[PDB]
Amino acid sequence: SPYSAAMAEQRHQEWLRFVDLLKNAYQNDLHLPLLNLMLTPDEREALGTRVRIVEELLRGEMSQRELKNELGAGIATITRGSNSLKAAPVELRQWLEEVLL
Amino acid sequence: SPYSAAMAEQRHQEWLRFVDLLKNAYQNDLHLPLLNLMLTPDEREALGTRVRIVEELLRGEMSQRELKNELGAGIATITRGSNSLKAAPVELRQWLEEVLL
């Protein structure tokens, strides 16, 4: 039932509605309270850390435990971050290199 | 310790860095791939469902228990979202009542 095409369609519509809602929140300077409402504290903390992981993966200068050192992320978390960056369209990846480095 | 002054300060700045990175992604129409990179599929699904919860709570036409029957979220999740809505600043609440309802 969660795995039906109907639920897949509903999930994507709901995601796109959120995406569109946050787009307009940025336009109206309400993005910060909106992200406080819609995300828990540990999710905000995780998003801030994930930015630093992507930056350091793209810079390519640190190993496992130093990334585990200054960020406290396990080897599994960094691997999944690495997987996700490998899948990213390179328009996104090249822009991230420009702004994060 | 995660519960120190320096770690709190860094947690705040890392979160605001993500918020600004995403603001720039919207401006460049890279928000969808950035959000596919930075969030897991289940976090994206949760955010879609949380928009629906906030909508129905503000609407006030759906009982908190029949919210679970429609959306799948446990009463504990409905309650936490209601807690976050009660803590939201009024200007956000007023804006959501325009755009969600």
Ligand SMILES: O=C(O)Cc1c[nH]c2ccccc12
């Ligand atoms: O340290 C704090 O002020 C509380 C807190 C917990 N998780 C957070 C994520 C982002 C910003 C603040 C917090």
Ligand SMILES: O=C(O)Cc1c[nH]c2ccccc12
């Ligand atoms: O957070 C996870 O466990 C997976 C993950 C998704 N995007 C990431 C970006 C950087 C590091 C980890 C992840």
Ligand SMILES: O=C(O)Cc1c[nH]c2ccccc12
């Ligand atoms: O509350 C504060 O700002 C003081 C403080 C909390 N944890 C600390 C760890 C090391 C040095 C100072 C603090």
Ligand SMILES: O=C(O)Cc1c[nH]c2ccccc12
């Ligand atoms: O998802 C959670 O458990 C917490 C939560 C944060 N914002 C929410 C909005 C609606 C429903 C739940 C939440």
